[PDB]
Amino acid sequence: TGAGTPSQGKKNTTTHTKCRRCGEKSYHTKKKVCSSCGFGKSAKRRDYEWQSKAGE
């Protein structure tokens, strides 16, 4: 079976959903953790410095 097109057919699972905390569709409903704001893992909001050029 091709890992391409023919393997695209089984993708009827729901994972990342609208996050109750930040409103982005990144709340992983299996993990109960948001990939965007960290809701469900961190009380503090997710944020890293590599999200921007070092000097900015």
Added chain:
Amino acid sequence: SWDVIKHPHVTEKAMNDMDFQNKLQFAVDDRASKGEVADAVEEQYDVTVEQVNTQNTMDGEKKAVVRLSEDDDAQEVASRI
């Protein structure tokens, strides 16, 4: 504080229920239970509510189908508004 009754849901189907089944249809706040819908209705129109059916609509609001006792007449209650 929010009010239970929002406004009368008037549509062809609502009419048929009022004319043929003695039922009044309302747009009610979605946090309202059938019982709350019942009381509010009786108090607002002075009638006897027999049964209430609810349905959360694809319009973002809750719809309530309220049936009045044979004693009361929906057609008349609705005609005064």
Added chain:
Amino acid sequence: ERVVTIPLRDARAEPNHKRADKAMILIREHLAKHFSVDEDAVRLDPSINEAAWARGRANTPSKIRVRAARFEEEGEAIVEAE
């Protein structure tokens, strides 16, 4: 008006699984020519159709006697089985 025998030997030039259709066309082309009329004015009563489609879309009879009449203000023919 008259009674005419239409040859459908030329329907074999068309792929066999579609003889009916072609015959049906041949019938219209025949009349139009023999009754000096436009193929647009030629009306074929459904009898004619059911005759051509009798044994399926692939088995059309080699001839067909057809009764036609000619007239009106633009000119036309109406036809049927016999």
Added chain:
Amino acid sequence: GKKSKATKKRLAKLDNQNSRVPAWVMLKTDERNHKRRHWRRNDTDE
């Protein structure tokens, strides 16, 4: 699929947001809905 009361509310808003700019606004502004979302061509969140 089984949707929840909250979900249903959202899908609902989206459907509404999918109406066209009323004619009167055209006149009142002397003269497009950039948020038009087809159910087949577009994909909603969640």
Added chain:
Amino acid sequence: TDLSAQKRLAADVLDVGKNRVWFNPERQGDIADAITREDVRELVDEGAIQAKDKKGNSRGRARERQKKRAKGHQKGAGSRKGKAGARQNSKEDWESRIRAQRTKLRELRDEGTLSSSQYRDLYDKAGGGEFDSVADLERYIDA
């Protein structure tokens, strides 16, 4: 005119497949104006709308064949397709046979013709497949 909506309606009211509902070709206009189920029933009662009859497969030729076969014909080597044990399940047939034989012996005992010792003997022999059929058994019984 477009009577497609009605078609779906007639089919539900007539309680039949859409493909079986017929609309009188001369009353399209009237049928076109039909908008409510009631309007349909009405056109139905006027015979403007009817339901075609559903066919059933004729079992005539089937029955003729069934007779010839029940009488023993059309079952030659050239008419068999499955293996033999396929046409008749050997285990099933032994159950058929052994039960018949066990019933037989059962009667003769109660009947008195057989002492519970002769019976025992024959039963045990049957269970050992000594008798091809009940007929064979009776035959053996008679010395």
Added chain:
RNA sequence: UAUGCCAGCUGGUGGAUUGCUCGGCUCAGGCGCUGAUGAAGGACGUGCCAAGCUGCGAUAAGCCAUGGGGAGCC
């Protein structure tokens, strides 16, 4: 002299150019904490008609007081 070549003329296509700037970029002075009295952020609401933006929060493009302001406004 068809098909056609080169240049131009009229019209078009296109949106360069010139002009314009409600936006940026940079420097400089001032100022500088918010949150369980539930913030920041988000969601959903909220208009006569209201899709977006803004505002606002079931008292919902708003309610009150005081000052200013002024014949206009929504």
Added chain:
RNA sequence: GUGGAAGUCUGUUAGAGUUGGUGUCCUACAAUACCCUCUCGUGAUCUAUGUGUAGGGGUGAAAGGCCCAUCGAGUCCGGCA
């Protein structure tokens, strides 16, 4: 004779697999497709859903296979001009 065992046999039952045609296609219907052919088909079977293992780490009846068209070290952004 009975019995009905088997990583048993035939088998396009369903389902799974993919040998040859080096056919068709090869700006495709398709970033791995179509057809015929072929294998397995009561078992170390096939399958849905849920759930666990994460990047020098997994997973691997081992082919350096696989870990979302990405693998002799995934992807994203940063170090980075």
Added chain:
RNA sequence: GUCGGGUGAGAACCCCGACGGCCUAAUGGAUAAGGGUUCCUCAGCACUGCUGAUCAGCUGAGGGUUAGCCGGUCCUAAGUC
């Protein structure tokens, strides 16, 4: 598919009838996931539809989902917080 016919400014492909066919573990019936209003009605053709369209899953406006006894809800599984 064909012959008639209906509607329409306009009809090979929108609708009716007949004739002729196609699908039989599916091209039928009920559904999970997923989609998200695509469902119904009216009004339309600038977009979308491998041609056309009076049709439409398109454009626009309205309307539509009613449960003590179907699901969720409750319980506990691998396992998760």
Added chain:
RNA sequence: AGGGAAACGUGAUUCAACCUGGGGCCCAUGAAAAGACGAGCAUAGUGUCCGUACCGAGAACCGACACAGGUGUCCAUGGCGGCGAAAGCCAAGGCCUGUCGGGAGCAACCAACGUUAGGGAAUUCGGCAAGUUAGUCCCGUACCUUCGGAAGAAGGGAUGCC
């Protein structure tokens, strides 16, 4: 009661569902908890909350597309056929939307395919491709063998209808 225009049957066979048993297997032992029963009856009151449209696929899902791909369950008892949930034909139900059409005996060429006299693998790396054989019953069956198998060995015969 209901439903049917009407009649509004009776018996039978085979019997999915459902029920209830017996046997056999394991260096494999085939969940748990809530709940129910155990523990009667009358009358009355209460039974809120969330889901409910539609598609479910060669156009409503995933695959950038109205994509020839991919995508789970139940209907496995509709008829003939036959071993059969097989072929082939046909119902019920669905469809003419695997959605551009018109015309030329319609050439060359190509894709799928049928038939080819005599010869019969001379073709080719190679019988690649195609073809031959074929279902059922009866007879009959070698070397070899781990005695299980080899074996449907091979070979010979039969086969319809009335």
Added chain:
RNA sequence: UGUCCCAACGUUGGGCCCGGUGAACUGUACAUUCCAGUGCGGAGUCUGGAGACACCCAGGGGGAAGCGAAGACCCUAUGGA
């Protein structure tokens, strides 16, 4: 047994003509070439001759060292893994 001797005829869909729809690849310029020669030794464009009226349709693909891919082979780099 059409694999072959050695091919023929036929079937269906294309192909061809017409209505409608309507891309892509590719493009320094010029360009009707052919035979020779010459040139960085593999020229439609240089040199010498020959031939050559323009346009269009269909074809099978000889040539444009045809199009497609900053050669995987080989070597080089005080490259990587």
